[PDB]
Amino acid sequence: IVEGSDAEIGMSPWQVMLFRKSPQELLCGASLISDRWVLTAAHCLLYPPWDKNFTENDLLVRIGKHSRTRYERNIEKISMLEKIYIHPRYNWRENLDRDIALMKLKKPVAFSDYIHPVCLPDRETAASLLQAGYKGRVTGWGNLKETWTANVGKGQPSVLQVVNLPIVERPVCKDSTRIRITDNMFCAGYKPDEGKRGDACEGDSGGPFVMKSPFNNRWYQMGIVSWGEGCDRDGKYGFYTHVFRLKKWIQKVIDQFG
Amino acid sequence: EADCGLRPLFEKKSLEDKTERELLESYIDG
Ligand SMILES: N=C(N)NCCC[C@@H]1NC(=O)Cc2cccn2C(=O)CN(Cc2ccco2)Cc2ccccc2CSC[C@@H](C(N)=O)NC1=O
Ligand SMILES: *[C@@H]1O[C@H](CO)[C@@H](O)[C@H](O)[C@H]1NC(C)=O
Ligand code: NA
Numbered sequence: 001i002v003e004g005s006d007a008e009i010g011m012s013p014w015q016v017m018l019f020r021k022s023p024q025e026l027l028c029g030a031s032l033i034s035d036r037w038v039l040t041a042a043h044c045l046l047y048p049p050w051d052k053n054f055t056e057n058d059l060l061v062r063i064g065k066h067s068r069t070r071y072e073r074n075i076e077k078i079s080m081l082e083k084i085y086i087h088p089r090y091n092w093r094e095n096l097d098r099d100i101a102l103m104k105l106k107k108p109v110a111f112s113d114y115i116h117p118v119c120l121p122d123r124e125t126a127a128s129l130l131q132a133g134y135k136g137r138v139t140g141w142g143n144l145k146e147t148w149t150a151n152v153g154k155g156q157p158s159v160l161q162v163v164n165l166p167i168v169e170r171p172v173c174k175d176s177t178r179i180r181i182t183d184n185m186f187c188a189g190y191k192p193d194e195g196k197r198g199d200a201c202e203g204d205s206g207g208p209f210v211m212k213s214p215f216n217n218r219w220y221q222m223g224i225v226s227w228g229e230g231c232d233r234d235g236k237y238g239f240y241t242h243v244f245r246l247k248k249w250i251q252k253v254i255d256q257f258g
Numbered sequence: 259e260a261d262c263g264l265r266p267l268f269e270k271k272s273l274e275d276k277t278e279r280e281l282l283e284s285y286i287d288g
Contacts, residue, residue, distance in 0.1 A: 010267035218263030
C-alpha cells in the first residue's frame, strides 16, 4: 500500500495472508468471507506469463495477523487448503477479466476479536455504494512504493497498511489504459489534480476493497485488488475485481462444494 | 454468516476507527 497508514489492531479482521508453503513466501492478500471460505485474485494462483500455477497443497493462509513478519501467538491462525477454485472464464491473456478465486479451508477457522468475516454485497448495497467519488478501503502488507531504494529496499511495512481511495468514473478508468477493461472490474484512485494520492501495490494483489454501509453499519467487500501499471503513478488507477458482478459464481461454488 | 462485517473491536463495542469517517464523508459531500 502506497501512501497509506498503520492499521489499528483488529481494524480489518477479515484480512488474510496467502503463502507459498515451500520455500516460505508471502504471495498475496485475501479475505475471509465465512468460517471456511477465503476470496482472492485468480492471478495469485494462476498467471502463465510469470510461471505461477499453485494448487491447494502448495499453499497456506494466515488469519488474524497485524505484524507482517512477527509470529503472533494466541492471535494468528494457520490453515491449509482443501480445494482451489478459479473462475472458469478468467482471462489472463488480454485483460485479467474475472480475476477471482475461492479457497476452501481444510478445517473451519474459529472467529475471535482478530478474525471475523466480511459481508458480500447484495444488489442494493452495490448499486448504492459503487458510485464514482465514493471511497472504499484497501488493506495489505504489499510494498510501500513502486521502485526499489536502499531504505528497506522497495519498502515493506511492519504492520498492515490501510488506505482509502475514491471510485473513479468508468470513462476516466477506460481512458487511463490501453487495456480493454470490462464491466467485471472497476478502478479507484485520486486523479492528478485532486492532490491526495494512494494505491495498492505489488503484494497487495488478492486483498479486499471494502466499503462500510451507512444503512446497517456493516463492512462489505466490493473489490479484489487485481492489476495496475506500477503503483501511485499520476493518471493511473488501481483496477479491482467487481465482486458483486461475480456473486453468482461465488455462490454456486460455495453451494456445490460446501 | 448473519454476523458478517461487524468488527469485534469496533462496531460491536461502539468504537470507530481513525479513518472510517472519511468514507462516510465521501458518501454525503459533493
Ligand atoms: N497499482 C495497483 N493497484 N496494482 C498494481 C500493482 C503493481 C503492478 N503489478 C501487477 O499488476 C502484477 C500482476 C499480477 C497479475 C497481472 N499482473 C500484471 O502486471 C499484468 N500487467 C499487464 C496486464 C494488464 C491487465 C492484464 O494484464 C499489468 C499492466 C497493465 C498495463 C500496462 C502495464 C502493465 C504491467 S505494469 C509493470 C508490472 C510489473 N513488471 O511488475 N506490474 C505492476 O507494476
Ligand atoms: C497447473 O498445474 C496442474 C498440475 O498440478 C496442471 O494440470 C495444469 O494444467 C497447470 N496449468 C497450466 C500449465 O496452465
Ligand atoms: Na494514480
